[PDB]
Amino acid sequence: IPGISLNEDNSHYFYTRAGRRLSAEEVDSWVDQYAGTQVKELMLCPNCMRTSYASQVWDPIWRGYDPAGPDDQPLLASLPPEERVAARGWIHTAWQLHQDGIDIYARWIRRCRQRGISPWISMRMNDVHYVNDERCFLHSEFWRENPQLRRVPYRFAEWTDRAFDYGRAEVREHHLKLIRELAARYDFDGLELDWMRFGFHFRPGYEAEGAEILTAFTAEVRRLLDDWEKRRGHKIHLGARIPSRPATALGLGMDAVTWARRGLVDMLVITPFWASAETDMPVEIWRQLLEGTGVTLAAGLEVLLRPYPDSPLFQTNSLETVRGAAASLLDRGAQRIYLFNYMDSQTAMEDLENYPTLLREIGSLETLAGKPRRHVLTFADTWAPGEPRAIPLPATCRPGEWRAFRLHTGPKPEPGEVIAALGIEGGAIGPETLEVRVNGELCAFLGLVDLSKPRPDFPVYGFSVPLAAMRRGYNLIEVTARQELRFGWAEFLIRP
Amino acid sequence: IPGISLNEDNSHYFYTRAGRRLSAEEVDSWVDQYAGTQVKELMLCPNCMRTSYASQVWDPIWRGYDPAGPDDQPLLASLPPEERVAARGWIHTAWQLHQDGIDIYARWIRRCRQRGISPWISMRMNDVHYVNDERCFLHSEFWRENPQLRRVPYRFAEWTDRAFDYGRAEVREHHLKLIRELAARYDFDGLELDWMRFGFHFRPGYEAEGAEILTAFTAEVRRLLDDWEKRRGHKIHLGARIPSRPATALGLGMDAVTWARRGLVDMLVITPFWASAETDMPVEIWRQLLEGTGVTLAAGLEVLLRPYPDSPLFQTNSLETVRGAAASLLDRGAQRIYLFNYMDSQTAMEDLENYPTLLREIGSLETLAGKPRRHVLTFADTWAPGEPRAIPLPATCRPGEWRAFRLHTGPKPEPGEVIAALGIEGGVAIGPETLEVRVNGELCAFLGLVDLSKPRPDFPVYGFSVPLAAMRRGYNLIEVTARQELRFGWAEFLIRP
Ligand SMILES: O=C(O)[C@]1(O)C[C@H](O)[C@@H](O)[C@H]([C@H](O)[C@H](O)CO)O1
Ligand SMILES: O=C(O)[C@]1(O)C[C@H](O)[C@@H](O)[C@H]([C@H](O)[C@H](O)CO)O1
């Protein structure tokens, strides 16, 4: 009964259905796969710097597009020939829908309402994909012509260096124009301000003035949607995506506790940016901060599952690791599981065969109960400028030294097997090279563990955990090495 | 004004006044030095595992002591000779006070009231100094006979591995006996439960059950003081020292937000353990957490000022660096600056001549305005078991890479000089263009080598002149890129109005 909020990105549908000539019936069929699942809300993203619909205030993705022309036309000249094909799929499918008199977002909203799903619009507030290519098709002409509106003029080390500065009245006006348009065009249940595309909105050093500035913006948005409530005759929700820790969120000019205490929002999605799902987020701290405000707190998953920022492995979550992250977060008081980049194809779990089951299981502790789950150690990808970073892996243990890893495993396990699994990097070990304890109790050596994906490219060794040692919430692995060893992977496997 | 809370530890007075014969008048005079300062409360600590007063429920520090005997006597046997002298100064002075019918805490409490100072008792909840020496004088017999009550039986790698397990009913009862005696013997304005000596109270992995346990314990302390409030005829406050970040505080079984919301405590002191003062603590998050509770939030300073955990430097704060910490934390909304280890001698600021000035300035922005201050980058020394650590220094910048440091420098500077000062390790001297330095994106001019007064590193510190208008209220962001590989070991803002 917490349920699932699921995000469809601005590009996916147009890329993956490219070359078909979609009937209204096919377009509608896309909502149906989520019908009768634990999905309460579809968060339909219509935009990056450009819209995928036929906007009158912003650039549609096809601004500059010659439908009858060759791939190397001006709009696409800047990509290599292979990506021209990919990008033209998105551009051409979205344009061809428009020419057919099909508004994909109005169709999806109307289909959502018929199948008993609450339809949301989620707006990217500051997308910067491929801003290293200034002639790139998916940039607004507003962006292209106003380099003086970028947050970091003195350097280009990162895409977020060329993000819009919401410190500028013209940047806030530009984004308010789209919001005004979306609220007039579409009869949604909720607008979501996706601050986490890409989370960086201000000059470095200006984030405190920043926090005042996004609070006043969110209030003007709330007052706008109030007026539309009278025009639509129903309640219209305002939500926001924000970083996973309060100090990083406030540090990036997002004071959500103020937004919450003032009734500017009624839903908040704590999340990482992209580099990995966080399996461990301070949900109970947020619940205390948000107490009495009646905001829905949603715990945001990402599709990738990676042990540390510099890992060369890029694989996704499986049903077992999502079950792990969901069991844990629901257990900490998350009032929704929010999925991002978990779409029906291309950007999606690698075990796509299990997507129907996933959408029917991870919205409730009751449906995850007695089901195999995996609780993997990852990291927070997002930090405020100069904010000290806390990255648990990789971690070297010298001989005679102790290291501890805490992992949140949500509800006390059902009867069955519990394994503490540790990945060792650099080419190793015997049964006594590690001494392993969970909550102080000695674990038996099991041997090499045959992990299914996601998995590291180095040996993972299993330690058997006395079932009685396992506790509700955090469980503490404490290891000592008799040989210098570097860990690059840690999880609990639970098999009821 | 927010003002100052100042903690007197359980051993300092007895050590420093050793061999004097102390009359009631001299004992009282220890308070007077704080009279007319910005100090509002003195936190009088009467205990480690042993009491410094003549307890009837716990071991006094002199349990086993032969007053007439030599230094080489059972109680002191375990120390080497030159530490016997020091320990014995504490033991004999605490004992001799008692023998003369002087209850030092009763005299200090009484004298606090005469001087307009609010008198508090601060209990050490789980002191573990020298638990490596099971024979040591300062351990309780209860601790010595009951190794099965310790929080980590399977290794000894840290003093906190031999701390009491507050998950045991026997450990709670042992600690509640002292509290019950403290409330009956001393008519104090408040009790502080100092959890932060040494912050580690539960078996590894038991910290969530721990959280319910310390809330229930706190609640019995409040119910006990409610009774004494009727007996004594005035309000008695209850406070706690807890970690500096709410995540770390809850991960060690301290759920202070529950204590506040339920009306158990009316002062929380956020603090490091010891290894350094934190110049940067999330005061705004704590104020949001504590909103509408009426709890006083005090920002805890320690006397050491060190740049990273592995630093071999062990220099203290100066007046300039406490001015800096104080300006910053009051400007974020601390309702008290709380001083631990800033005593009148031995455990003291190294520039001790400036102690009277410090006590009349750091408790208000008004008394800090117009004064030179230093804002130094340090680190948080305390982290919950398995909790990932965020430690900004040292930081290595490769040629063409950028590195950011955020330092909270409180109110916008008055007109004057603002220096971003950066210490570079590894026996390198840079040029004026080896570093490009920016503050809130504005290009800083090269000043040269800065002449720092202590605390200072033992490597060169290079000054960058910051345009005044660039300096912002609160956090100010140093961004640096190196044209040669460098390691930073120090960062600070110097503000000279
Ligand atoms: O933001 C993202 O994490 C992402 O959703 C990932 C997805 O795999 C990719 O196809 C889209 C796409 O790059 C944008 O929609 C273009 O604007 O972006
Ligand atoms: O905890 C501390 O930081 C400290 O207060 C520091 C001080 O410099 C030292 O003298 C005392 C003493 O070690 C205890 O009082 C023993 O019980 O400890």
- Supply the DSSP string of B4-16, one letter for each residue: EEEEE-SSHHHHH
Alpha-carbon Rg for chain B, nearest whole angstrom, is 23
Between CA B302 and CA B315 the distance in angstroms is: 12
Q: Decide whether any atom of ligand 2 lies within 6 Å of the B140 Cβ.
A: no
CB spacing of A384 vs B406 below 8 angstroms? yes
Between CA B411 and CA A36 the distance in angstroms is: 56
Between CA B142 and CA A362 the distance in angstroms is: 50
- CA–centroid distance for A127 within its chain: 14
**Which residues are within 8 A (CB) of A389 and not within 5 positions of it... i.e. 6 or more apart?**
A380, A383, B390
Spans of all domains in chain A: 1-370, 371-496
Which amino acid is it at A244?
Answer: S
- CA–centroid distance for B228 within its chain: 28
CA of B11 to the centre of ligand 2 (A): 7
Between CA A286 and CA B289 the distance in angstroms is: 9
Print burial letters for B402-423: b (CB count within 10 Å at least 16), e (below 16).
bbbbbbbbbbebeeeebbbbbb
Roughly what angle, to the nearest 10 degrees, separates helices B207-232 and B169-185? 20
Between CA A239 and CA A270 the distance in angstroms is: 11
The CA angle B441-B439-B463, to the nearest 5 degrees, is 140
Q: Decide whether any atom of ligand 1 lies within 6 Å of the A347 Cβ.
A: yes
**Which residues are within 8 A (CB) of B231 and not within 5 positions of it... i.e. 6 or more apart?**
none
Q: Is A210 exposed, middle or buried (0-12, 13-18, 19+ CB in 10 A)?
A: buried
Q: Decide whether any atom of ligand 2 lies within 6 Å of the B138 Cβ.
A: yes
Assigned token pair, B188: 């104090």
Find the helix or strand (DSSP H, E) in which B213 lies.
helix B207-232
Q: Which of residues 281-320 of B touch A (CB under 8 A)?
A: 282, 284-285, 288-289
Query: Which residues pair with residue B493 across a beta bridge?
Result: B375, B420
Assigned token pair, B248: 């770390």
CB spacing of A204 vs B404 below 8 angstroms? yes
CA distances from A143 to A61, A146, A201, A449 (A): 14, 5, 14, 50
Out of A7, A9, A343, A382, give the residue to mutate to test ligand 1, the one with the largest number of ligand atoms within 8 Å of its CB: A9
The verdict on A247 touching B (C-beta cutoff 8 Å) is yes
**Which residues are within 8 A (CB) of B220 and not within 5 positions of it... i.e. 6 or more apart?**
B176
Out of A196, A347, A350, give the residue to mutate to test ligand 1, the one with the largest number of ligand atoms within 8 Å of its CB: A347
DSSP class of A55? -
Q: Which of residues 418-477 of A touch B (CB under 8 A)?
A: 437-440, 442, 469, 471-477
Between CA A259 and CA A267 the distance in angstroms is: 10
Contacts of A328 in chain B (CB under 8 A): none
Between CA A317 and CA A367 the distance in angstroms is: 18
Strands (E), A385-433: 395-397, 402-408, 417-425
CA distances from A354 to A341, A360, B323, B414 (A): 15, 10, 60, 63
Query: Which residues pair with residue A270 across a beta bridge?
Result: A242, A299
Among the partner-chain residues B386, B473, B476, the one whose CB lies closest to the CB of A404 is B386
Assigned token pair, B49: 């595992």
Q: Mark out the alpha helices in A392-455 (DSSP H runs).
A: none
Instruction: Report whether A492 contacts A475 (CB < 8 A).
Output: yes
Instruction: Report whether B194 contacts B122 (CB < 8 A).
Output: yes
Which ligand is located closest to the Cα atom of residue A302? 1
- Max CA-CA distance within chain A? 71
- CA–centroid distance for B379 within its chain: 14
Between CA A270 and CA A248 the distance in angstroms is: 11
DSSP reduced 3-state for A451: coil
- 3-state per-residue secondary structure call for A308-349: CCCCCCCCECCHHHHHHHHHHHHHCCCCEEEECCCCCCCCCC
CB spacing of B288 vs A204 below 8 angstroms? no
The closest of B326, B333, B338 to B364, measured between CA atoms, is B326
Query: Which residues pair with residue B403 across a beta bridge?
Result: B480
Assigned token pair, A126: 């500051």
Between CA A445 and CA A427 the distance in angstroms is: 19
DSSP reduced 3-state for B221: helix
Backbone break loci in chain A, preceding residues, C–N > 2.5 A:
427
Instruction: Report whether A60 contacts A119 (CB < 8 A).
Output: no
Cα nearest neighbour of B394 on chain A: A388
Between CA A461 and CA A139 the distance in angstroms is: 47
Between CA B424 and CA B394 the distance in angstroms is: 9
**Chain A interface mutation, best of B258, B310, B402, highest count of A Cβ atoms under 10 Å:** B402
CA distances from B121 to A28, A459, B9, B10, B260 (A): 70, 55, 10, 10, 20
The closest of B262, B88, B43, B52 to B178, measured between CA atoms, is B52
The closest of B77, B94, B177, B183 to B134, measured between CA atoms, is B77
Between CA A87 and CA A22 the distance in angstroms is: 18
Experimental approach was: X-ray
Assigned token pair, B302: 């320690």
**Which residues are within 8 A (CB) of A119 and not within 5 positions of it... i.e. 6 or more apart?**
A41, A42, A44, A108, A109, A112, A113, A188, A189
Between CA A365 and CA A107 the distance in angstroms is: 33
- CA–centroid distance for A248 within its chain: 16
Between CA B145 and CA A112 the distance in angstroms is: 69
A 10 A CB-CB count for A61 gives 27
Between CA B183 and CA B193 the distance in angstroms is: 13
CA dihedral A387, A388, A392, A393 (to 10 degrees): 90
Instruction: Report whether A366 contacts A327 (CB < 8 A).
Output: no
Query: Which residues pair with residue A164 across a beta bridge?
Result: A150
Strands B395-397 and A237-242: unpaired
A 10 A CB-CB count for A353 gives 9
Q: Decide whether any atom of ligand 1 lies within 6 Å of the A129 Cβ.
A: yes
Q: Mark out the alpha helices in A39-153 (DSSP H runs).
A: 81-99, 104-114, 141-145
Find the helix or strand (DSSP H, E) in which B490 lies.
strand B486-496
Query: Which residues pair with residue A453 across a beta bridge?
Result: none
Print burial letters for B457-474: b (CB count within 10 Å at least 16), e (below 16).
beebbbbbbbeeebbbeb
Q: Decide whether any atom of ligand 2 lies within 6 Å of the B159 Cβ.
A: no
Tally of CA atoms within 13 A in the half-sphere of A37 that contains its CB: 25
Instruction: Report whether B477 contacts B437 (CB < 8 A).
Output: no
Assigned token pair, A147: 């380099």
Q: Mind giving me the DSSP string for B110-168?
A: HHHHHTT-EEEEEEESS--TTTT-TT-TTS-HHHHH-GGGBS-TT--SSGGGGSB-TTS
Between CA A137 and CA A146 the distance in angstroms is: 16
How many H-runs (helices) and E-runs (strands) does chain B carry?
14, 18
Alpha-carbon Rg for chain A, nearest whole angstrom, is 23
Assigned token pair, B161: 């591995």
Q: Is B319 exposed, middle or buried (0-12, 13-18, 19+ CB in 10 A)?
A: buried
Between CA B134 and CA B150 the distance in angstroms is: 13
The closest of A244, A304, A240, A308 to A271, measured between CA atoms, is A244
The closest of B309, B312, B233, B238 to B278, measured between CA atoms, is B309
DSSP reduced 3-state for A102: coil
Between CA B270 and CA B286 the distance in angstroms is: 9
User: Long-range contacts for B350-358 (Cβ within 8 Å, ≥24 apart)?
Assistant: B350/B315, B350/B316, B350/B318, B350/B454, B350/B455, B351/B318, B351/B319, B351/B453, B351/B454, B354/B318, B354/B319, B356/B33, B356/B37, B357/B319, B358/B319, B358/B322
Tally of CA atoms within 13 A in the half-sphere of A118 that contains its CB: 18
Query: Which residues pair with residue A192 across a beta bridge?
Result: A122, A239
Find the helix or strand (DSSP H, E) in which A194 lies.
strand A190-194
The closest of B31, B205, B49 to B114, measured between CA atoms, is B31
Task: Please tell me what resolution, in angstroms, this structure has.
Answer: 2.0
**Which residues are within 8 A (CB) of B291 and not within 5 positions of it... i.e. 6 or more apart?**
none
Distance (Å) from the alpha carbon of A43 to chain B's nearest alpha carbon: 30
The CA angle A68-A73-A79, to the nearest 5 degrees, is 130
CB spacing of A471 vs B155 below 8 angstroms? no
Which amino acid is it at A259?
Answer: W
Task: Give the number of residues written for chain B.
Answer: 497
Among the partner-chain residues B204, B389, B477, the one whose CB lies closest to the CB of A385 is B477
The closest of B113, B92, B107 to B25, measured between CA atoms, is B107
Find the helix or strand (DSSP H, E) in which A185 lies.
helix A169-185
Assigned token pair, B100: 């003369």
Among the partner-chain residues B205, B391, B406, the one whose CB lies closest to the CB of A439 is B205
Strands A441-442 and A434-438: antiparallel
Instruction: Report whether B299 contacts B283 (CB < 8 A).
Output: yes
